[PDB]
């Protein structure tokens, strides 16, 4: 059942990526505006 066992993990792992990566891009750009305030 390698169709219904192994491929059931590729379908799951991509769901954790597609919001925790969005969590970073919101957060690092939040620092990036803050870093612009510091050096200036």
Partner 1 sequence: PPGGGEQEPPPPPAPQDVEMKEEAATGGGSTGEADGKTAAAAAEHSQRELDTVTLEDIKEHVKQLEKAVSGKEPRFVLRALRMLPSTSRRLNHYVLYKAVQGFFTSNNATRDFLLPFLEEPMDTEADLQFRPRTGKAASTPLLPEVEAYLQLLVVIFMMNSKRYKEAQKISDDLMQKISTQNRRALDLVAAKCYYYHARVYEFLDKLDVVRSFLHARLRTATLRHDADGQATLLNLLLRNYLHYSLYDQAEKLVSKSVFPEQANNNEWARYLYYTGRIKAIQLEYSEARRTMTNALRKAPQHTAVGFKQTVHKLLIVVELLLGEIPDRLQFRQPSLKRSLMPYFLLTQAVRTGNLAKFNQVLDQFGEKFQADGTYTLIIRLRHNVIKTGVRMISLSYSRISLADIAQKLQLDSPEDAEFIVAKAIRDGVIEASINHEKGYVQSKEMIDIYSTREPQLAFHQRISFCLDIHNMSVKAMRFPPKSYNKDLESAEERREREQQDLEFAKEM
Partner 2 sequence: DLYSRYKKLQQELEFLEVQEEYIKDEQKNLKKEFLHAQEEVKRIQSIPLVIGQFLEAVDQNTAIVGSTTGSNYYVRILSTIDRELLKPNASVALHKHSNALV
Partner 3 sequence: GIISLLDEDEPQLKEFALHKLNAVVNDFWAEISESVDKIEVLYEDEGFRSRQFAALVASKVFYHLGAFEESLNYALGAGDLFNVNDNSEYVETIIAKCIDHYTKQCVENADLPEGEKKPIDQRLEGIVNKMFQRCLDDHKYKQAIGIALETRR
Give the interface with partner 3 as residue ranges (CB under 8 A): 1-2, 4-6, 8
Smallest separation, CB 24 to partner 2 (Å): 5
Smallest separation, CB 20 to partner 1 (Å): 14
CA distance 40 to 29: 17
Core vs surface per residue 3-33: b (16+ CB within 10 A) or e: eeeeeeeeeeeeeeeeeeeeeeeeeeeeeee
Residues that bind partner 1 (CB under 8 A): 7-8, 10-11, 14-15, 18, 26, 29-30, 32-33, 35-36, 39-40
């Amino acid at each position: 059942g390698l169709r219904q066992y192994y491929l059931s993990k590729i379908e799951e792992l991509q769901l954790i990526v597609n919001d925790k990566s969005q969590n970073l891009r919101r957060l690092q750009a939040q620092r990036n505006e803050l870093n612009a305030k510091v050096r200036l």
